Structure formats: C-alpha cells, structure tokens
Amino acid sequence: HMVGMSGIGLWLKSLRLHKYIELFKNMTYEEMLLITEDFLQSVGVTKGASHKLALCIDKLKERANILNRVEQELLSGQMELSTAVEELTNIVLTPMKPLESPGPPEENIGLRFLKVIDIVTNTLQQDPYAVQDDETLGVLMWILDRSIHNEAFMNHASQLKDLKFKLSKM
C-alpha cells in the first residue's frame, strides 16, 4: 500500500465494507478522495455499497472541519467530552497521511487529530468528575489505543503511550 493507505483494511472492516478491499489495491490517498458513487457503481460495487462508501468518503473530506469544530467547542466549553470522544471514534480508524506531509497545518488530519487529543485529555484531567465517567474514559483509552498503532503517528507513539498511561492512573 502507498502513503496514508496502510489502514485501509481496518477502516473498511469498521464500515462492514471489507468485501471491497481489493478495489483500493494500488490506489493512492488522493485518488481515494476522488471516489464518487457513480464511479463505484461503474466498477462493480452494488448501488447500496456505492452510496454508503461514497458517503463515508465524503465524511473523510469533512474531517478537518469536524476536528476544527471539536477543538473550538471544547475550548469554549460548549461541547461535552463524551461528544468529543464520540466524534473522534469515527475518525481514529480512517486513512491518514503521515504528520510529515507538507501543506497547510490546518488541513493536516493527523496533526488536527493529535491536537484534539491533547485538548480532550487536558480538559479531562481538569474535570473533577472526569474519573467518574467510566464510559467516556473507556472510549478514550480505546482511541489512544488505536492511535498508538496508527502508522501516521509513528513518531508520536511514545508520547501517546505516556498519555494513555497517565490517564490509566487517574
């Protein structure tokens, strides 16, 4: 697989679409983002899966805005941690290019994702009852878990394990 596509299989499995793993064979990250429902129907994907995958690809394109929004609303106190962690859950397994990918930092998905993780874990440790929310804390630990193994975060794995360790001891 090419840059940013090492997690394509796990992502598809998460959407119950791993049946189409071969479609991505030598596809580049940029090509994946050019996928349309029309293209999928044309290459043998059922109309149902074509629509669903097209929707998922569209959501991939919204990641930067979603992360930007979560960052903002958490900093303003408008968004609950449970909500922020739910949003992250739907992004953590998506195909992400390495942090070292040149371009506007604001559009660097991996970077925005790690930024939100910092805000979340920081807001958490400052919440007197944070420890009492077993559900939210459990999802977050799973997120850190999947992030530690995301090749795009290769050079941050150490910091992530540390963070996850700190939280496990609250």
UniProtKB/Swiss-Prot annotation:
Region feature (Interaction with cup): 3-170
Outcome after substituting F39L: No effect on RNA-binding
Tissue specificity statement from the Swiss-Prot or TrEMBL entry: At syncytial blastoderm, it is located throughout the bulk cytoplasm and pole plasm. By the time of cellularization, it concentrates at the posterior pole.
Signal peptide coordinates: none
Record note on what altering Q41L does: No effect on RNA-binding
Impact reported for Y20F: Reduced RNA-binding
Effect upon mutating R146S: No effect on RNA-binding
Location relative to the cell: Cytoplasm
Known outcome of mutating K13A: Reduced RNA-binding. Complete loss
The protein's assembly and partners: Interacts with oskar (osk). Binds to the 3'-UTR of nanos (nos). Interacts with cup, which in turn recruits eIF4-E, leading to an indirect interaction between smg and eIF4-E that prevents mRNA translation. Forms a complex with aub, twin, AGO3, nanos mRNA and piRNAs that targets the nanos 3'-untranslated region, in early embryos.
Function, in words: Translation regulator that binds to the 3'-UTR of specific mRNAs such as nanos (nos) and prevents their translation. Prevents translation of unlocalized nanos in the bulk cytoplasm via the recruitment of cup.
Protein name: Protein Smaug
Species of origin: Drosophila melanogaster (Fruit fly)
Gene name per UniProt: smg
